[PDB]
Structure 1
Amino acid sequence: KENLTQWAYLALNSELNIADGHARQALSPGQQKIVNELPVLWAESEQRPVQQIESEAHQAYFTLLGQHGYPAEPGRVLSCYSSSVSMEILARSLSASVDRVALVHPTFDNIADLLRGNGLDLVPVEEDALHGADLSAELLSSVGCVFVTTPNNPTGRVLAEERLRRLAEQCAEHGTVLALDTSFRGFDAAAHYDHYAVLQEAGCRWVVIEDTGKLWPTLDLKAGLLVFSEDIGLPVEKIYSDILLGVSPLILALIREFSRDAADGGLADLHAFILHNRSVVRRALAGVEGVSFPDPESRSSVERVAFAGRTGTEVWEELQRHHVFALPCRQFHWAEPSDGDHMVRIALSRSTEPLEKSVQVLRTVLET
């Protein structure tokens, strides 16, 4: 298994999948009511111009999460099948004019595998240095792009506004591209200050990749949103049009409707449900010997756990035998895999029952 997706494949057909980060819990009542009008949404998607549906979907999802200054003129937000598709467009776009990319480490490994597969070299930036300290002028001058995941995956760490401001400002000095993956944006209110405000204010060249997938159990019906400053001067628009005409108006209508249910109280319900499920795993494992939780303040839908006397791979292997699937964290540490030798990632975007089943099996594996 050469990336976390190949580990996650093994989980997809198991009742005890706690590996991939997609939302697989039950629909709420308000979400089921949306599913129930799909034949009506379908007809609306046949009948209306996609540009109207698309605008309403973007307006609903950005405002929902505080990004009021998002560029709303047609063309500026590029709807992609997935955040990974948005990522490939950007990585291939960079490769034309950039050699090296400074990337937060750790982070989800397909970000690095895509950047490398498109010919970019990476220089890692540990999280401490990223947040708690400016970045070295020797660094910025040697890279064409800076790339942050916030909320990060697997750590949940949020880039504070103050530091986002400084970072965009540093990038403006060097004419460097500043890129953000905000897939997890909706789980943590610390991420809902208007990033398009600080970004457009610094006036650097910037790219943001939003994602609607993680948040709601939509059966992987979703969009990645690629937003770029007017001065990006990367060929993201042409490469986008090489790949797709657009996304399905029905998926867009569904984003709109799920965004509106989130704004009528569904997002608070979701933050609570994720908190409950985080409590449930911590309740069952903090008292075990060796077990610590390194992201004590994470609000993300995935949770890391650390053990002191065995390797995260070995926990994975022992877990498999009882039909439970999580992720070994080595590969999140894409620049030094050993950094994640003693950790596994657990998915919380699951209904509480099979989650509890899984951690109790995790308990027993650890008490061996």
Structure 2
Amino acid sequence: DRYDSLTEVEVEGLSYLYNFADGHAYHDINEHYVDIINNLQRYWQEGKDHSIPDMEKAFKNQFAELIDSSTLHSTNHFSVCPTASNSIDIVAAWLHKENKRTALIEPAFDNLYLLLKRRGVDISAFDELALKNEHQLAQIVSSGDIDALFLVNPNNPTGLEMTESEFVYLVEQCKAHNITILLDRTFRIYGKTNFDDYQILEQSGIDYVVIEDTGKTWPTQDLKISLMVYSEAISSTMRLLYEEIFLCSSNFALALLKQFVAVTAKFGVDATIKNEVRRRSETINDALAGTGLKVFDNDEKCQLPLCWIDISATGYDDVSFAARLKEHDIAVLPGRFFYWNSKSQHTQFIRVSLMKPDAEFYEGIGKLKEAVTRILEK
């Protein structure tokens, strides 16, 4: 009885007709990407015709071109994992080996906490809001209690996203107290920013690891690629840990996702990614309008491919409301596990994932509004 993790809920949700639990990219191949699937053999062949090191660097440089980072394009200190949680787990093992006290962002997707904990890291919580408040952040980094800071930018599920100023300030302060910055950029492509985080990190001279992901952005049936990019000074040990578990990732997966990334650069994030996101976000906001559930929104957040919802006016807590919705064939994520250090004090949110197969999504949202108003009427 009871749920121990978000992933447990997501596994259960795989059996429901309308699964809004896991936030993995599972929408349909839109018109811009169809030629890739039509030409799967071309990318099979490209992986066959190139060396593993050449394919790693080619995907990395294609990504650096898409995000326009001359610094990512020039660094050779990186590894490629098949999933971003693998990259995180390697970081956790490094954090433990180097005896680094780590403050972890809260809220966060809970397996970030679970992986750090399982590796034996000394973990403290730190408020995501401190990233947009110089005074609070300064108190945290100057305390003498921490050696590393693990962030998710933009953060899941709130969409909190740092400005250039805030990131520069963040990097300035960790440098002054010899703090390593762990940056999970899984949702980077959804950010409304456009600046060179790698350049700011490299110019600074601090120790860092940045983790990228394709899995929350390009729907490739969880055939994924995760760049793990790190500073020169910690490179030798990071690569040693990586090599304990991996020789390389798949050249076929690299060739495939390289072309997803190149197509997004050619037609822009809007035509290929963000326009459908905005339409899905509007569809859920409209469906929930006037129901009492309050979609989490603010002036400064970016639009994650996720909806974070306050249900306090329902009088229900997240697990009980998710249970009632499960009766209607609808699976959503209870939100308390995102508050991994303080679950009991954050029981009023659910999360609804938007990047699901197109028909299941739009039909599912209609079923959700009916379910919410039927549950509320009784």
Does 2:207 align with 1:201? no
Decide whether aligned partners of structure 1 residues 306 and 234 sit closer, same or farther in structure 2, where only a CA change above 3 A counts. farther
Aligned twin of 1:253: 255
Residue type of the partner of 1:346? V
Partners in 2 of 1:352 and 1:248 — Cα distance? 28
Q: How much has 1:86 moved relative to structure 2?
A: 0.3
Q: Is the 8 A contact 1:99 1:121 kept in 2?
A: yes
**Unpaired segments ≥5 residues, structure 2:** none
TM-score (norm 2): 0.92
User: Quick one: structure 1 residues 14 and 226, their matched pair in 2 at CA, closer, same or farther if it must change by over 3 Å?
Assistant: same
Q: Which residue of 1 aligns with 2:185?
A: 182
For each residue in 1:55-112, what CA deviation from the matched residue of structure 2 results, as whole angstroms up to 9, or x when unmatched? 22111112212333115344x1210011100000010011012342111110111111
**Residues 32-43 of structure 1: matches in 2 within 5 Å?**
32-43=34-45
Report the counterpart of residue 319 of structure 1 in structure 2.
325
Seen in structure 2, the aligned counterparts of structure 1 residues 221 and 72 have a Cα distance that, compared at 3 Å, is: farther
Quote the residue 2:68 is aligned against: 66
Correspondence 1:13-32 to 2 at 5 A: 13-32=15-34
Secondary structure of 1:235's match?
helix
Name the SS for the 2:120 alignment partner.
coil
Give the deviation of 1:50 after TM superposition. Answer: 2.3
Q: Percent identity?
A: 28
Q: Tell me how far apart the structure 2 counterparts of residues 104 and 138 of structure 1 sit (CA, whole Å).
A: 12
Q: CA deviation at 1:340?
A: 3.0
Partner of residue 218 from structure 1, selected from 207, 220, 244: 220
Contact 1:71–1:77 (CA<8 Å) still a contact in 2? no
Kindly state the Cα deviation for residue 325 of structure 1 after the two structures are TM-superposed. 1.1
CA–CA distance in structure 2, aligned partners of residues 174 and 73 of structure 1 = 25
Q: CA deviation at 1:148?
A: 1.0
2:146 aligned to which of 133, 143, 147: 143
Shift of 1:228: 0.5
Cα distance in 2 for residues equivalent to 1:93 and 1:99: 9
Q: Report the counterpart of residue 302 of structure 1 in structure 2.
A: 306
Q: Which runs of 4+ in 1 moved over 6 A?
A: none
Aligned to 1:287: 290
- Is 1:328 matched up with 2:347? no
Query: Which residue of structure 2 aligns with residue 168 of structure 1?
Result: 171
Q: Which amino acid aligns with 1:148?
A: L
Q: Aligned pair in 2 of structure 1 residues 346, 320: CA closer, same or farther (>3 Å)? A: same
Question: Are the aligned partners of 1:144 and 1:176 in contact in 2 as well (CA < 8 Å)?
Answer: yes
Q: Which runs of 5+ in 1 are unaligned?
A: none
Map of 1:360 onto structure 2? 366
Tell me the CA shift for residue 234 of structure 1: 7.6
Q: SS in structure 1 opposite 2:275?
A: helix
Give TM-score scaled by structure 1 length: 0.94
- The offset of 1:266, in angstroms, is 5.3
Secondary structure of the corresponding residue to residue 189 of structure 1: coil
- Secondary structure at 1:62 match in 2: helix
* RMSD (Å) for aligned C-alpha atoms: 1.8
User: Which residue matches 1:93?
Assistant: 94
Larger displacement relative to structure 2 (271-280 or 233-242): 233-242
Q: Is 1:350 the equivalent of 2:351?
A: no
